[PDB]
């Protein structure tokens, strides 16, 4: 996360870590508990290929990465039967929790937005995660969860943005319908985020709009973050996940 | 990276001042940080300081009234003053020592820009202004407190100004002027405005010049 | 408790200068330090721990001192140089540490002579009901001044306040405003008015005057 | 180049070496000298963002990098407008050089595929670079350039090939038909040699098939290495070199 | 530390981290309260050169790093007039704090050894630290304090060790007099722990035998590392730290 | 090598360059051909612990490294007894090569100083290399022999030198009366450059006055190189090398 | 990083002049190098470059009596022009283009400081000094060719200094005054010292000023 | 072949001014670049590919053209901001390239009187049998002037030369000098000796002379 402060402690409830395995549970990508048995995450961390879940697991909100780490399997992983890289679209996954957690003081489900909701900019919306501070810096040791309130950018605009500084025609479209831009030069996501939530505070309730998907390198010039955008999804994860 | 100060400016006896101090842009974590006081004309005088051990320190005068804190969930640091009279009227500065002592002098390297804290009875009033007219000029008349500022032209003009210390009429009410000094043939060519604000007030004002 | 001396003095352009600062007993392990203050600003560090140059500082400055008196010495002052100066340093830790008073120092230059302007109250103070007029003197050296007011010919005395601008750091000389208080029923009695500096950088004095409202 | 030889001195004329600048003008990518003043290349390579020409050199075929350097000045590149990622497509790419070249006993143009051209499974083909040798094994200090002979895979049974051990239905077409797969698990290129030319000897006469465009890693199980099929844009590349 | 567990949380009161200033207050050293207001390390890690106290702070026996930074303050930093180099001898020094600390239930001092002890081989004897645990092997993000029972080995056996396998005369003492050896191969320091405290339990007491100096490489065979033997340095000592 | 030119072709032939196998035979440290039989070398490049030959070749006056690579074997290491670290002396080390070398209009051998030489400063010394040209800064790929002139900087004025900004008392010789200084702030040696000749131009012939054995960094202020005195050992080396 | 031309700076009618251009502190590989010309007043002119490929480009006028080349093995660049006559006389300046264009001028970023080439029948003199008494001065008189060059108190008095044009005296030699501007306080308090060189004739002199 | 227009401009400080450059033909792939020339330095480029800033520039400059007439422009001079201007552009690769003409701009300022020295000839000139007198003036506006001289009074016409520096980058204003050729012969006879300046600055002429040798 470049720039915001760190997190308060209360505040975002819903945030996953998706550890891998190796010398120790590294945290690699970011997740959102959607339901209590199902956790939202980003594609392109888990996907395209094959990954053996005995490599996998799932961290909930702690307030500082492996202080307290009380690691919990995956049952299952999903992905959007279309994704194959961010920059093609359907970046979106879903993991399914092997054991249900209790709903708690601590824990609590994010809400997804109704199908009808678009997000017009200037909507007050943050992005939070562990990921690293500028370009090769490690989020230092004490690993908090940063936060940070990004603006949102409006697609056509955003999709001309990109245009800027490179030579692929205008005529193609680089930001597709099912993505979402937010960020500034000196507020975005950056390596390791990915798969965190954007949140937007519509009537006081916080709404998931989207999900760290990918851009080109972190705060850079003309180069807004690309999220997904959640809103085109629900069909396809009210087939697994019921309320 | 830098401190910035922060606090009302303006209160009144036996109240109790608090200033806050906060670091702009970067982990406080392992710095100390002192408070420095000067009143009007006079050299600069040590108020406290608190280690990054968090161990406090003060004065020989200021045990008695000072106290100082910190607060890692906001980065910031804060000082109370309690029960304050005018003679504790001065500009306040926060700065850092890179050794991280909390008592010692020798090393400030880096500083907050200060604030004046005015300890008054009276209460707030924004200023009236006026042109000075054809050089240019521009005057701020019986406003309070202290800390005015002044620019030209949305301060694009920041060449050739002159600016004044502030002088205490007998209404109880300071008075400043500006000037800028440039040859007549710019009388047919530029704006001359005179952009002013008042924090203390929140009062913005602003007038063109003419002859 | 510290001593620093001279209170103040006064050096030309490319001059070299020493500053002394004393104490009843002497420092801590080397910890004391000289700060240079521009009017209006912040403080800066110059030197710490006796005698470690500060980073981004010209080689002008140095000192150096036995645990109980130091110097602090500009090898060759520069417009840029004009501020007060002030040594700090620690008897203990957490025990004593003070500020000395501070050192003001001025460029000693040529004189200058005045530029001189006037100003009558303008129309909203003749609306307002309040009477000032402005006079201005600019660039004059040395601080040395007087204002006479002059208005319908009739000396003026009292009433008026003068501020003076501190030394500038690209001429190295002063602005000085003068005002009188005065009531619109007190101004459109007198119809003649004139400001009137008298200075060391002039042969004589030199009338500026209005008599068009 | 995973396998295959250093390639004798005389067989490889057309071989381009894209340097940028640096701590030294660093090869980077590869190319094919299409014609006496113009080098062929993937597009990835130099796009899809502006580079400074000031930043960017071509060196003819020397035998090994850095012992012979003569660099050669680039006017202009040009990337197909409807570029992006690879993974999309259309990652080609010409730099049209300042100095046109004497053609000589060391150096001649390769010769492009007419378009009838399909290149069917089997025939004789090779890639050649200075790439990396397996995974993060860089090229010796030699410098040799290596070269290697792949099989030709037909693109639908590539694409099968992709699917295994993926996520992504098999609706969803990965390899797209402006490209070409070819390779295999002991005879790939690799990171270094993208841009570089795919050649087969129709009728004793070498045409460049293909451009070395992407892959999932070198040398992969059911992962050959993807081509930009040269085919494709013949009617884009005579938009700029007469012949 | 190679091998050995998690330390218990009370079992080690006296265990000091230093930290340098960078991107983060990064651990580099350890160190021992011998007093309350001395801390007694390694030379190598602080010397030869001057460093500027700046960059220093020093932080008490908390369990994990970074979760509780209550860094201190160094006033002065002391190294032996004699040190150069740890292959030469006297790696040893001191810092005085600037704040004197509080004897509390969680911080105690160490108790240094009397001068007529030798520390013969068979003592039970401990080192701790949160050096690396192998050979690149950095300690995982948890950070405990990891601590470990090594043999002492006395020190003309030990002087036969080293000139296993090495071109060196038997003549020529490696092990000098003011030096101490143990661990094993299956146990020792490594880098990181450098400056921490080597205790020994007589009589119940916990005495300070020498701090981590130097070994070629951790856990090699025929390679213990070498410990400064404090035993040596203490009229240098007291010099300093009045009891 | 920091400063100083490429060296011309014809200039130094003596110049040798040790190789390690890895996964090419890289270069690691220096040397010199003082016998058609012998090469002259630092002895912390080879000791103290004992490397399999296996691992060993030397590699004679190319131009540039590996570009014309003839790696002869190398048929013992010989170091002297008293050596243990560079920082106490004696580091240097001889090899006897298998095969006997044609002495040849490229390749001459190095003439040894007599013993009454001192080298007062100001003498016209080079040292010559293909170690690092900075501080991280490795030679460039073409690899080309360094060359530069250095200053020779009398010993007990060099000591001072070396305890400027440092903690060990100036009763402790650093620089023992085996060793000699060269160097300055713009010229010196750096890393891979270790065991390289010293050579000084008295009576137009070329005397080697040392090699190149350690120094704190390279070009840094007041550390000089430290250089092994030749002349301290030959009562050594005629031990091994017959004239 | 920066260029160094040299060459002798004086030469015969119908002789060939050499210059050399010397890449200080880097490799050249991979840049062009190109040579500028600017007689005296007028504006500049392009003689030529060679690209990073090492060919060579000429203007039109140029490719009748110029060569240009290079040399890796000493990092140098060099210009020959043969047959020089009085109308060659111009200031020349080398300058990289960091695109390696051999024929371009519009990214010229980096130039070396150029030098004076005089063609001429006249032998070298060094120059005559005097000089000019209290402001103070100093003058240099009746030397040959132009470069000279003048420096206070070993260049240390870098301030309030002017240095005039030449100007070609009937006595076919050029003559120069520098001048220093102060208060005469100072006259009893430094030097004034006229640090004087000519490189041309290898001569360096030097004179005090009094009144 | 290029036309850059005008060939010369004076301006003040703050105005805003536009700099144009034409050909024949159109430039190539937008090769075109603009130098600034300070007075005895080398070109310093500006702007090149007919646009981009190069770095370390402050964004008064600006420049664009449609390939074949193209633009410089200053948003606000500065006395920094004295030199000759040139475009220069490539038409072809290896063919036709060049700079244009130039373009030499002069900050418009007020007034400025001249501050006037006068020297003799001083002993070796003297003893070197030859004399020349110089006489000086100093930040003077604009460069127009004439010298007088006036030796026992008589006039002094041809004999002398002047030299006139460029402009100034801190103040903008210029340095005249002016001498005689004259022998020893020809100067111990004549025993008075003045120059006199003229200048627009001034009211009258302003005298200095010397009769002590």
Known sequence: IVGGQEAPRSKWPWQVSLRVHGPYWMHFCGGSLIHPQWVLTAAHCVGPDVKDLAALRVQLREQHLYYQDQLLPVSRIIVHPQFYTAQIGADIALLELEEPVNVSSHVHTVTLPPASETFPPGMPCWVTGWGDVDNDERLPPPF????????????????????????????VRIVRDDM???????????????????????????????????????????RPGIYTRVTYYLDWIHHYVPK | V?????????????????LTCTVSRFSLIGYAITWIRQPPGKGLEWIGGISSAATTFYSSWAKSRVTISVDTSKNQFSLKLSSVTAADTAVYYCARDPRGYGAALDRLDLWGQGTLVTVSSASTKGPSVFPLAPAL???????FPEPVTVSWNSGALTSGVHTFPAVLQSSGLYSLSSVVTVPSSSLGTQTYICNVNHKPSNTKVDKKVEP | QMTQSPSSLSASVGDRVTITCQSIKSVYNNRLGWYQQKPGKAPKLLIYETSILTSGVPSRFSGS??????????????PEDFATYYCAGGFDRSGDTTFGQGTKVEIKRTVAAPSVFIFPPSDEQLKSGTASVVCLLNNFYPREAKVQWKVDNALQSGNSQESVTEQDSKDSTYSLSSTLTLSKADYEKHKVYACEVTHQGLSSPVTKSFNRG
């Open chain 1, 180 to 222: 979402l831009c937010a960020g500034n030069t000196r507020r975005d996501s950056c390596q390791g985020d990915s798969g965190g939530p954007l949140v937007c505070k519509v009537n006081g309730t916080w709404l998931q709009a989207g999900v760290v998907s990918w851009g080109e390198g972190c705060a850079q010039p003309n």
């Open chain 2, 2 to 18: 830098q401190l910035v100060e922060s606090g009302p400016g303006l209160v009144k006896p036996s109240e109790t001042l608090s």
């Open chain 2, 137 to 143: 000029g521009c005057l701020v008349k019986d406003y």
């Open chain 3, 65 to 78: 001192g036995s645990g109980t008196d130091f110097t602090l010495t500009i090898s060759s002052l520069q």
């Open chain 1, 144 to 171: 908090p969860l940063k936060q940070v309130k990004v603006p949102i950018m409006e697609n056509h605009i955003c999709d001309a943005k990109y245009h800027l500084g490179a030579y692929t025609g205008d005529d």
